Write an enzyme that holds these catalytic residues in place. Structure first.
Site, PDB file in Angstrom:
ATOM      1  N   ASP E  43       0.827  -1.194   0.000  1.00 45.14           N
ATOM      2  CA  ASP E  43       0.000   0.000   0.000  1.00 45.14           C
ATOM      3  C   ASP E  43       0.870   1.255   0.000  1.00 45.14           C
ATOM      4  O   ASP E  43       2.101   1.197  -0.022  1.00 45.14           O
ATOM      5  CB  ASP E  43      -0.938  -0.001   1.205  1.00 45.14           C
ATOM      6  CG  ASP E  43      -1.456  -1.387   1.538  1.00 45.14           C
ATOM      7  OD1 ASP E  43      -2.210  -1.950   0.717  1.00 45.14           O
ATOM      8  OD2 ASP E  43      -1.110  -1.912   2.616  1.00 45.14           O
TER       9      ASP E  43
HETATM   10  C1  LIG Z   1       2.276   3.732  20.989  1.00 46.12           C
HETATM   11  C2  LIG Z   1       0.762   3.704  20.808  1.00 46.12           C
HETATM   12  C3  LIG Z   1       0.307   4.517  19.599  1.00 46.12           C
HETATM   13  C4  LIG Z   1      -1.168   4.292  19.282  1.00 46.12           C
HETATM   14  C5  LIG Z   1      -1.955   5.593  19.151  1.00 46.12           C
HETATM   15  C6  LIG Z   1      -2.086   6.059  17.704  1.00 46.12           C
HETATM   16  C7  LIG Z   1      -2.919   7.332  17.580  1.00 46.12           C
HETATM   17  C8  LIG Z   1      -2.845   7.943  16.183  1.00 46.12           C
HETATM   18  C9  LIG Z   1      -4.213   8.056  15.518  1.00 46.12           C
HETATM   19  C10 LIG Z   1      -4.187   8.965  14.293  1.00 46.12           C
HETATM   20  C11 LIG Z   1      -5.474   8.900  13.475  1.00 46.12           C
HETATM   21  C12 LIG Z   1      -5.397   9.814  12.255  1.00 46.12           C
HETATM   22  O1  LIG Z   1      -4.499  10.572  12.155  1.00 46.12           O
HETATM   23  S1  LIG Z   1      -6.665   9.767  10.957  1.00 46.12           S
HETATM   24  C13 LIG Z   1      -5.827   9.737   9.347  1.00 46.12           C
HETATM   25  C14 LIG Z   1      -6.358  10.827   8.423  1.00 46.12           C
HETATM   26  N1  LIG Z   1      -7.355  10.301   7.505  1.00 46.12           N
HETATM   27  C15 LIG Z   1      -7.044   9.287   6.512  1.00 46.12           C
HETATM   28  O2  LIG Z   1      -5.957   8.838   6.411  1.00 46.12           O
HETATM   29  C16 LIG Z   1      -8.138   8.785   5.578  1.00 46.12           C
HETATM   30  C17 LIG Z   1      -8.168   9.324   4.152  1.00 46.12           C
HETATM   31  N2  LIG Z   1      -7.092   8.745   3.372  1.00 46.12           N
HETATM   32  C18 LIG Z   1      -7.410   7.798   2.322  1.00 46.12           C
HETATM   33  O3  LIG Z   1      -8.544   7.529   2.112  1.00 46.12           O
HETATM   34  C19 LIG Z   1      -6.291   7.178   1.482  1.00 46.12           C
HETATM   35  O4  LIG Z   1      -6.776   6.932   0.192  1.00 46.12           O
HETATM   36  C20 LIG Z   1      -5.755   5.870   2.077  1.00 46.12           C
HETATM   37  C21 LIG Z   1      -6.899   4.951   2.495  1.00 46.12           C
HETATM   38  C22 LIG Z   1      -4.874   6.167   3.289  1.00 46.12           C
HETATM   39  C23 LIG Z   1      -4.937   5.151   1.007  1.00 46.12           C
HETATM   40  O5  LIG Z   1      -3.572   5.348   1.240  1.00 46.12           O
HETATM   41  P1  LIG Z   1      -2.521   4.978   0.027  1.00 46.12           P
HETATM   42  O6  LIG Z   1      -2.100   6.245  -0.675  1.00 46.12           O
HETATM   43  O7  LIG Z   1      -1.304   4.292   0.592  1.00 46.12           O
HETATM   44  O8  LIG Z   1      -3.201   4.056  -0.956  1.00 46.12           O
END
Ligand SMILES: CCCCCCCCCCCC(=O)SCCNC(=O)CCNC(=O)[C@H](O)C(C)(C)COP(=O)(O)O
Ligand SMILES: CCCCCCCCCCCCCCCCCC(=O)OC[C@H](COP(=O)([O-])OCC(O)COP(=O)([O-])OC[C@@H](COC(=O)CCCCCCCCCCCCCCCCC)OC(=O)CCCCCCCCCCCCCCCCC)OC(=O)CCCCCCCCCCCCCCCCC
Ligand SMILES: CCCCCCCCCCCCCCCCCC(=O)OC[C@H](COP(=O)([O-])OCC(O)COP(=O)([O-])OC[C@@H](COC(=O)CCCCCCCCCCCCCCCCC)OC(=O)CCCCCCCCCCCCCCCCC)OC(=O)CCCCCCCCCCCCCCCCC
Ligand SMILES: CCCCCCCCCCCCCCCCC[C@@H](O)O[C@H](CO[C@H](O)CCCCCCCCCCCCCCC)COP(=O)(O)OCC[N+](C)(C)C
Ligand SMILES: CCCCCCCC/C=C\CCCCCCCC(=O)O[C@H](COC(=O)CCCCCCC/C=C/CCCCCCCC)COP(=O)(O)OCCN
Ligand SMILES: Nc1ncnc2c1ncn2[C@@H]1O[C@H](COP(=O)(O)OP(=O)(O)O)[C@@H](O)[C@H]1O
Lengths: 52, 98, 320, 459, 88, 55, 64, 54, 104, 347
Positions: E43
């Site tokens: 990915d």
């Molecule tokens: C040590 C413990 C740690 C645990 C805690 C972790 C907390 C962090 C949580 C953060 C949550 C966020 O930021 S939320 C992230 C922000 N939103 C998104 O990523 C969704 C929109 N992106 C898409 O739809 C893309 O098409 C995709 C599917 C990625 C395809 O990727 P590729 O281009 O590859 O194909």
């Protein structure tokens, strides 16, 4: 007006060096053959025929 | 010579060896300098007390005085070194070569 | 008593002469903008000494008789031929730029010497802090090499760190088309050859690097073309400024003494201008150097020290 | 003796107070007058030397050398003033100052009565020569030449100094008269062997001895014309003079010690004469010829007989004059064509006939044509060597042949044949060059009438 | 002296070494010309992680616009060669 | 063979080569006081043993 | 210019100590010196021993 | 013809940090024109403290 | 620039005969050149060479060669008039020489 | 730094040196050394930069170690004889400690490493002070205790100093390091003759100080610290380069210049003591110092290096500050050989 790369240098080993040396001495590359590479100090100079 | 004299001279030798062999920290070398001064104070005091050299009793005090100056001097330099590097490691003092 | 450690020890101090109107002022702007008249008017209104913009022969103005010397003995560069052939393979462009930076460094030293010795303020046209914009323009038009820029940065880094920046930075803002119209109306044939790209490069360098940098340590007064003609408003705007930003309030007698030791002794000022970096544009060969130096020493009043040349009317030499 | 030293010192303010256009005239005139004054030291007494004072003395060996130095100064100025025309007034005055200081150091060296003062002046001669070579030489090699000329000398002279002071600690004096009168034999021991080596090696390297001579082609080739003149004519003689002063305390060690130096000198004169046959540079040929002649002088001094000393003195004087003339002759063509290659400019007799005559006379004196004093010295040395050992003639004979073989060769290469077609800037000879040639050659032929003036104290 | 004159071969070997250390890649089905999404089935986030490993290995940062273009080991090799100015 | 090579090789070229090598060895130090003071300790020990016991 | 430079200045930079070069240098450099030393030493030792025996016929030999 | 004088290439032999450049000292850099090195970005961390809640 | 430095071109040598067809090779200024020739010739050929040779030729016999010849003539006359040998094998008198008393 | 503060610091340095000179008590000599170091540390750091701080730190560490060893030698001498007078040490161990401490203070080999670094890290004025005035006190102490010198150790250190000075100077392009290595070699020359004739040591020190003062003043006047910067001086002040070349020749010991007088005298003195091998080796080694002096002369005054365009501006300005003792120092550095017998006034 005779620049630094127009002077005799060390004995040539690569064919490109031989072509460069031959052009430096105004000779055909087929005709240019330096002295054997011992320590006698001949270096790059062409070994011309021993005629007078 | 008493065995105490040998112990004090060995203390001076150990402090000199500790100063001459550097680890990272400069403060440790400064402490070795201070220990050398302390051993010199003890040695001179013992000799002067044993020989009953009365007027020499003020000699060790003078020693201490200049020891302080040296100590202060070293600390001053250390501050500046730290201010340049954020550390007192002697391996940062290599801008000059031989 | 020439000023020195002895003069500082007994009496002479600098802070006793600062009188709130010292305010080193520089009036910057693009080419052909009317910064000169504004600078002269500011100097006249505020009672400050005016410094006309340092040119090729600024050093000649302060040594010997104020008359300029020959181009091959002073400068060895031409602005007119820079306009004619900015890309000439004889390196006139960067040679001219380096000479102009040296002239501006000398003029800044002279202005600081005046201010620190008399307490009267000074007004400058450009400065060593804004000399770089032309350089950047020269680099973005393909007029100079990258090596020239690096050498310029080295010289600036070792030179400009030794002085205090000006109190007030006045900028005269004129758009590029108005600049071109003024150039065309001026009439000098060489300035007619300035392209719009060069002027835009100068303007971009100014507006993007000089003013943001100076605003951190100086106060910047920006004026358009129309509002720059009224000297009274500019002067009263300067008169109501609070100079509580840069390093000037942090200066005491000892730092002033160091600065005054530095601003006199012009050779110590110019020390690092001739660093042994061998760029072809500014490097002079041994034979040409010898010939030009011999020609210089044969000038009417240059063979000996100022007061020892009998051929320019110096008397009592044998008792001096 | 101050009657010669003081005017030589006065030459300095006189040349520093002259006009820009009158330095050469004044310097030449007063140098000629000083040479005339020095000409009066040739009145020698026979039995002993002319002891002027505690510091200075004159000898039948020192007087011709002093006269040669004083005569060589004006010729050096004459040769110098051509290639220094574009030079600034101050730097021209500095060059003339260098030459005057060299003359002063030489005249004080040749008359010092003690070995330490002799050493001090004999080392002081290094600075002006080094400055001249490295500052007014023409090529990029001059710096290297200077380095050689310096260190080759000093590696020889520093041990001597130690030996010298050591001697004064054991003898009590280094005055030449006391040293001579109280001379005692040198025993056969390692200490005496190393004292002999320390006393001999500096003068050996100054001659130069074969194997220690690599500094000389460099220094003489890269030097300006006056520098080459003074290097060949006078400076090479210093070591020779030194040997004749130092060998009085080295007996009887010299009988067995001198063997390696004699072998080196004979075989190396053969080698350098052969080297002259294959030399593409005209100055290098003259330098190697100087090496060969000085090898003959070294043999003469080493075998230690009165005839050998007379021959050595005559050969030193003759070689000085001849080598200076040859260097000037080469410099004329170098100024014409701006190159030192011998085959570049050929057939010059067609274009410059009087210069060809000067070339012929110089070549004839170089190959020791009788009755020239070159031949007198060479014949005396050869006879003394024959007395030393009958086999030596072989080597001697070989050298003679080879000398002619290269001498005329140079002449034939530069004067005869056809001229180079594309060289079209060979102007007629100036009066200055012709007068310089004549002032070189006329004293040489005149000295034939009175050879006893140049035969030394053993006469 | 400093590190020896790093060549293309050593860069390629290091890139494959750190690529085979990735757990989501079959160690033998990986080739220098293999496309990450297509041949390896990775990915975008896997590709970003690979670029992080690249940055860790070769000791210099890689911006996002460039990393969006590195899509196979050979492209990574070319980018590293260009950044380090390596001709062979 | 002799004048341009071997006489050059033995006296002047060997001298220059040896002095250059020795200069490179002597002057190329890292400028760290740790190494210098370790050498000082070694020198103090050597002087205290090889010389102080010979009197 | 090339011919002169190669004959004069280019020789040492292109010189290598080689068994051929070293052997030829040793021979042509020191062999003749030792040969001539042996010859002259033999001749002079013979002459000196002949003098010590009181037989050389040195009559009229007063210049040396 | 004129006397030879040093040029830029001849001059650069004396411009390095040391004569006789070896492989170890090839990375040595000449000291700054003024004896002033650029300051290091050795940022001194402040001490972070929890003041309260207890 | 493709140039390395700003340098004056190498000038061509100037002929002294061009401006002064009779220039003696001493100086560019004809008067100074002529007087340099005159002083060199007068003080070299005229004074040092002629007077010097004459002075050297008539140097007094300080080497005592005529004196030695006359002394030798007197000694030879006396010695061959009285039957004495012309020279003695001993340079010094053996009567004032005290050799070591024992040789074994 | 305030001018009054600087004057007070210089006076404190000089008064510490004089306290060492005039004292009869070992404690007062140690106090003079301590005062000299205390006042001398700030002078090295007048112009603040990391290099000056590093040089000051290295100097302080070296001198503090030397002072501690000095005091230990004094205390051992007191233990083996209840004496405080500086006449002649009564214990060979104390003598070895004192010799090593004074060698470290002087910078003799193998304690030479700090000298080039400290000289390079400070300005030309601080370098002048460090290489001229800082040699007086340890040399005076060594002269007072000369009859107790173990000749082997002293001569070994002197020969090492000469050799290392030559070899280290052979490799330098910075002028301050060249001066420091010259100082090391000259200090070796000074200490070679100390066990035989202290008057020769004083004469060598005087000549070396005169030539070093002339050299450093000529380097301050033509504000150059590298070889290539000094290659530009001829195009602005040719007289300075000519005088510098003559001074460099004098520093090489070439006759008839002043620098020849000390070595000469030293050599002859050593031959009075049946020392022949060592003076010969010392002279043949000083040839190296002569070599790199000649290299500097080649680059500075005998040839003309290419210059820069901006130099034309410098043609229009003179020097505002003049050094009053430079001409006398130059003349003493060159033309005092004929006045050699005056050394009898030094004993
Ligand atoms: C040590 C413990 C740690 C645990 C805690 C972790 C907390 C962090 C949580 C953060 C949550 C966020 O930021 S939320 C992230 C922000 N939103 C998104 O990523 C969704 C929109 N992106 C898409 O739809 C893309 O098409 C995709 C599917 C990625 C395809 O990727 P590729 O281009 O590859 O194909
Ligand atoms: C033995 C002869 C006796 C003659 C009596 C008078 C002699 C007077 C001469 C005085 C010295 C000459 C000065 C030398 C420089 C040349 C001058 C010049 O430039 O010419 C311009 C002048 C003008 O001509 P031009 O038309 O304008 O063009 C000329 C062209 O340049 C080209 O023209 P060129 O091609 O014709 O060249 C000019 C000429 C000039 O070139 C020269 O080489 C002349 C110099 C000769 C050789 C020099 C070195 C050899 C060593 C000998 C040293 C002896 C010195 C004795 C004392 C001398 C006093 C100064 O060349 C030659 O003629 C060939 C020379 C070969 C001679 C070989 C013989 C050597 C041994 C001879 C005997 C020596 C001892 C004598 C006693 C022995 C016991 C009885 O030409 C001449 O006048 C010719 C000169 C006369 C020839 C003399 C040659 C033999 C004399 C030897 C020395 C004198 C001995 C005196 C003792 C008494 C007997
Ligand atoms: C004999 C052995 C052989 C020869 C000796 C060795 C030679 C080495 C000498 C190195 C000297 C270093 C030096 O002074 O500057 C280097 C200097 C370079 O300076 P520069 O590059 O031109 O610019 C530097 C500026 O000064 C930049 O600095 P500035 O802008 O701040 O200018 C400040 C300037 C302007 O000065 C002022 O502002 C004047 C204001 C006066 C302030 C009042 C302060 C007084 C209150 C303090 C009292 C303390 C007393 C201590 C009490 C101790 C109690 C235990 O003052 C100075 O430059 C330094 C003044 C030197 C003080 C000399 C006074 C004599 C000391 C006597 C001490 C002995 C006491 C008794 C001992 C008894 C035993 C316990 O080198 C030279 O110019 C020529 C060298 C001349 C050396 C002597 C010549 C041969 C001998 C005759
Ligand atoms: C170019 C045109 C050429 C053709 C024209 C030429 C015309 C004819 C010329 C030929 C001349 C023939 C020469 C024959 C010799 C006659 C002269 C001779 O008798 O005088 C000699 C005398 O000559 C001089 O003594 C020797 C010359 C002196 C040399 C010094 C040169 C001047 C100094 C310049 C500096 C030199 C530097 C090198 C010096 C070491 C011999 O002296 P002597 O037989 O005993 O006399 C005994 C009687 N006395 C003593 C009473 C006088
Ligand atoms: C251009 C290169 C030319 C270099 C020439 C160098 C040749 C130098 C010749 C030897 C130099 C050393 C001589 C020192 C001065 C002599 C003083 C003397 O005679 O005293 C001796 C001392 O003799 C020595 O100590 C000599 C030892 C040598 C030390 C230096 C060695 C240098 C190399 C020597 C071998 C090379 C010599 C020839 C080289 C030729 C050039 C290739 C004995 O004195 P005492 O101590 O009282 O003993 C007697 C009572 N017990
Ligand atoms: N650093 C520089 N580089 C190139 N040209 C400069 C520089 N400084 C000033 N000039 C030239 O000076 C000329 C006139 O100066 P300017 O201030 O622009 O006009 P004005 O004389 O009306 O004040 C302009 O042609 C400008 O190019």
């Amino acid at each position: 007006h005779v620049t630094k790369d127009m002077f005799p240098g060390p004995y040539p080993k690569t064919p490109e060096e031989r072509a460069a040396a031959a052009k430096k001495y105004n000779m055909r590359v087929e005709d240019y053959e330096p002295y054997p590479d011992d320590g006698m100090g001949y270096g790059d100079y062409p070994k011309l025929p021993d005629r007078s | 010579m008493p065995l105490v004299y040998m112990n004090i001279i060995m203390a001076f030798a150990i402090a000199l060896a500790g100063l001459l062999m550097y680890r990272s920290h400069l403060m440790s070398s400064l402490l070795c300098l201070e220990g050398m001064m302390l051993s010199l104070f003890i040695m001179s005091t013992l000799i002067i007390l044993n020989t009953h050299f009365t007027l020499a009793n003020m000699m060790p005090i003078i020693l201490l005085v200049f020891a302080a100056c040296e100590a202060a001097l070293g600390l001053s330099l250390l501050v500046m070194v730290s201010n340049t590097y954020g550390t007192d490691y002697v391996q940062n003092l290599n801008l000059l070569q031989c | 008593l020439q000023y020195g450690p002895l003069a500082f020890v007994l009496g002479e101090r600098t802070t006793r002469k600062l009188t709130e109107t010292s305010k080193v002022i520089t009036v910057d702007g693009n080419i052909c903008s009317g910064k000169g008249r504004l600078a002269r008017e500011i100097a006249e209104k505020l009672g400050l000494r005016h410094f006309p913009e340092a040119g090729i022969h600024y050093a000649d103005s302060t040594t010997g008789d104020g008359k300029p010397l020959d181009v091959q003995l002073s400068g060895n560069c031409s602005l007119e031929k820079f306009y004619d052939d900015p890309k000439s393979n004889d390196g006139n462009s960067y040679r001219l730029q380096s000479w102009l930076y040296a002239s501006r460094l000398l003029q800044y030293a002279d202005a600081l010497e005046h201010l620190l010795s008399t307490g009267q303020g000074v007004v400058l046209e450009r400065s060593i802090y804004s000399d770089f914009v032309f350089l950047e323009a020269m680099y973005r038009q393909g007029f100079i090499r990258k090596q020239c820029v690096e050498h310029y940065n080295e010289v600036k880094k070792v030179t400009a760190c030794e002085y205090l920046p000006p109190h007030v930075v006045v900028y005269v803002d004129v758009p590029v088309p108005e600049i071109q119209s003024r150039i065309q109306k001026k009439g000098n044939p060489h300035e007619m050859k300035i392209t719009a790209a060069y002027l835009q490069d100068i303007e971009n360098a100014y507006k993007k690097t000089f003013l943001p940098e100076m605003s951190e340590k100086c106060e910047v007064l920006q004026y358009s073309a129309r509002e720059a003609e009224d000297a009274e408003k500019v002067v009263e705007d300067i008169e109501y400024l609070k100079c509580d930003k840069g390093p000037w309030p942090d200066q005491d007698d000892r730092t002033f003494h160091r600065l005054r030791m530095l601003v006199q002794n012009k050779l110590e000022v110019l020390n690092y201008t001739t660093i042994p970096v061998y760029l072809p544009e500014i490097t002079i060969g041994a034979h040409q150097s010898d010939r030009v130096f011999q020609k210089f020493t044969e000038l009417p009043g240059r063979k000996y020290s100022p007061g020892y040349n009998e051929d320019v009317g110096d008397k009592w030499i044998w008792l001096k | 003796m101050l009657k010669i030293i003081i005017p030589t010192t006065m030459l300095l303010p006189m040349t520093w107070m002259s006009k820009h256009n009158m330095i050469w005239i004044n310097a030449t005139v007063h140098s000629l007058l000083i040479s005339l004054i020095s000409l009066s030291l040739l009145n020698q007494l026979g039995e002993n030397s002319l002891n002027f004072s505690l510091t200075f003395f004159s000898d039948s060996l020192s007087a011709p050398l002093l006269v040669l130095t004083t005569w060589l100064l004006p010729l050096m100025l004459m040769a110098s003033q051509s290639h220094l025309s574009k030079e600034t007034t101050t730097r021209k005055k500095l060059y003339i100052t260098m030459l005057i200081l060299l003359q002063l150091f030489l005249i004080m060296t040749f008359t010092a009565t003690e070995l330490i003062l002799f050493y001090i002046l004999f080392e002081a001669t290094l600075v002006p020569t080094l400055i001249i070579i490295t500052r007014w030489g023409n090529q990029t090699e001059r710096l290297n030449a200077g380095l050689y000329f310096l260190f080759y000398t000093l590696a020889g002279s520093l041990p001597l100094l130690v030996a010298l002071v050591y001697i004064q600690n054991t003898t009590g004096s280094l005055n030449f008269l006391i040293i001579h009168y109280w001379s005692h034999p040198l025993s056969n021991s390692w200490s005496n062997i190393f004292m002999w080596l320390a006393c001999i090696m500096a003068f050996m390297v100054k001659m130069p001895l074969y194997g220690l001579h690599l500094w000389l082609p460099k220094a003489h080739v890269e030097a300006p014309i006056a520098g080459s003149m003074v290097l060949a004519a006078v400076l090479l003689k210093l070591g020779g003079y030194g040997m004749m002063r130092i060998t009085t305390i080295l007996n009887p060690l010299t009988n067995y010690m001198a063997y390696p130096f004699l072998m080196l000198s004979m075989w190396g004169m053969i080698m350098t004469s052969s080297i002259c046959l294959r030399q593409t540079d005209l100055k290098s040929l003259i330098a190697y010829s100087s090496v060969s002649h000085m090898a003959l002088v070294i043999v003469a001094i080493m075998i230690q007989t009165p005839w050998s000393f007379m021959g050595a003195t005559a050969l030193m004087i003759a070689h000085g004059l001849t080598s200076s003339m040859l260097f000037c002759l080469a410099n004329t063509n170098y100024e014409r064509v701006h190159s030192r290659t011998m085959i570049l400019a050929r057939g010059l007799q067609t274009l410059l006939p009087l210069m060809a005559t000067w070339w012929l006379v110089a070549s004839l004196t170089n190959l020791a044509l009788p009755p020239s004093i070159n031949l007198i010295g060479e014949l005396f040395i050869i006879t003394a060597s024959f007395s030393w050992s009958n086999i030596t003639i072989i080597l001697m004979g070989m050298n003679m042949m080879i000398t002619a073989l290269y001498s005329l060769y140079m002449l034939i290469t530069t004067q005869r044949g056809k001229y180079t077609h594309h060289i079209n800037n060979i102007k007629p000879s100036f009066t200055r060059e012709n007068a310089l040639m004549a002032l070189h050659i006329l004293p040489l032929l005149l000295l034939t009438l009175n050879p006893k003036m140049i035969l030394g104290p053993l006469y | 002296s400093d590190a020896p004159p790093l060549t293309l071969e050593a860069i390629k070997d290091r890139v494959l070494y750190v690529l085979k250390l990735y757990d989501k890649i079959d160690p033998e089905k990986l080739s220098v010309n293999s496309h990450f999404m297509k041949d390896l089935g990775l990915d975008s986030l896997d590709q970003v992680e690979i670029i992080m490993a690249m940055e860790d290995e070769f000791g210099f940062e890689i911006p996002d616009i460039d990393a969006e273009k590195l899509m196979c080991p050979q492209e990574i090799v070319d980018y590293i060669a260009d950044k380090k100015d390596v001709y062979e | 063979l002799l004048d341009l090579i071997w006489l050059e090789t033995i006296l002047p070229k060997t001298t220059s080569f040896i002095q250059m090598k020795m200069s490179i060895m002597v002057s190329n130090q890292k400028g760290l006081i740790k190494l210098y003071f370790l050498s000082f300790l070694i020198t103090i020990m050597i002087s205290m043993t090889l010389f102080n016991y010979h009197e | 210019i090339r011919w002169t430079y190669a004959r004069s200045a280019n020789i040492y930079p292109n010189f290598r100590p080689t068994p051929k070069t070293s052997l030829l240098g040793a021979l042509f450099g020191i062999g003749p010196l030792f040969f001539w030393y042996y010859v002259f030493k033999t001749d002079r030792d013979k002459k000196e021993k002949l003098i010590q025996e009181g037989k050389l016929d040195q009559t009229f030999n007063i210049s040396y | 013809a004129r006397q030879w004088q040093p040029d830029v290439e001849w001059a650069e032999q004396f411009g390095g940090a040391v004569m006789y450049p070896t492989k170890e000292t090839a990375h040595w850099k000449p000291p700054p024109w003024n004896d002033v090195d650029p300051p290091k970005d050795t940022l001194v961390s402040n001490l972070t403290l929890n003041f309260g809640p207890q | 620039p493709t140039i390395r430095l700003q340098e004056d071109p190498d000038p061509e040598d100037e002929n002294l005969y061009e401006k002064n067809p009779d220039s003696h090779g001493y100086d560019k200024d004809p008067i100074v050149d002529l007087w340099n020739m005159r002083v060199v010739f007068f003080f070299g050929f005229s004074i040092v060479l002629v007077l010097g040779s004459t002075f050297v030729a008539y140097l007094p016999d300080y080497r005592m060669q005529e004196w030695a010849r006359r002394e030798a003539e007197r000694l030879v006359k006396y010695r061959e008039a009285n039957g004495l040998p012309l020279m003695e094998s001993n340079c010094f008198d053996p009567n004032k020489i005290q050799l070591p008393e024992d040789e074994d | 730094m305030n001018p009054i503060i600087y004057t007070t610091l210089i006076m404190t340095v000089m008064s510490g040196t004089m306290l060492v000179m005039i004292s009869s008590h070992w404690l007062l000599i140690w106090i003079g050394f301590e005062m000299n170091l205390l006042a001398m540390i700030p002078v090295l750091m007048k112009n603040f930069n990391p290099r000056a701080t590093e040089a000051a730190t290295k100097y302080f560490l070296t001198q503090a170690t030397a002072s501690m060893m000095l005091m230990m030698a004094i205390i051992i001498n007191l233990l083996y004889s209840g004496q405080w007078t500086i006449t002649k040490m009564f214990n060979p161990v104390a003598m070895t400690m004192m010799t090593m401490a004074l060698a470290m203070k002087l910078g003799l080999s193998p304690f030479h490493f700090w000298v080039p670094e400290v000289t390079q890290g400070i300005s030309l004025q601080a370098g002048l002070l460090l290489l001229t005035w800082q040699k007086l006190a340890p040399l005076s102490v060594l002269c007072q205790i000369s009859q107790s010198i173990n000749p082997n150790l002293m001569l070994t250190m002197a020969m090492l100093s000469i050799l290392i000075g030559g070899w280290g100077g052979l490799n330098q392009t910075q002028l301050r390091k060249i001066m420091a290595y010259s100082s090391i070699a000259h200090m070796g020359w000074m200490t070679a003759v100390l066990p035989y004739n202290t008057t020769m040591t004083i004469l060598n020190l005087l000549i070396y100080i005169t030539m070093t003062l002339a050299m450093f003043m000529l380097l301050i006047h033509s504000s150059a610290t590298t070889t290539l910067s000094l290659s530009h001086t001829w195009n602005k002040m040719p007289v300075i380069t000519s005088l510098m070349m003559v001074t460099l020749l004098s520093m090489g010991g070439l006759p008839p210049l002043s620098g020849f007088m000390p070595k000469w005298m030293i050599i002859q003195e050593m031959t009075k003591n049946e020392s022949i091998i060592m003076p010969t080796l010392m002279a043949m080694t000083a040839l190296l110092n002569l070599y790199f002096y000649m290299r500097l002369a080649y680059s500075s005054s005998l040839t003309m290096f290419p210059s820069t365009n901006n130099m034309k501006m410098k043609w229009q300005f003179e020097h505002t500050k003049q050094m009053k003792l430079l001409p006398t120092m130059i003349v003493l550095s060159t033309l005092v050989l004929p006045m050699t017998p005056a050394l009898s006034s030094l004993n």
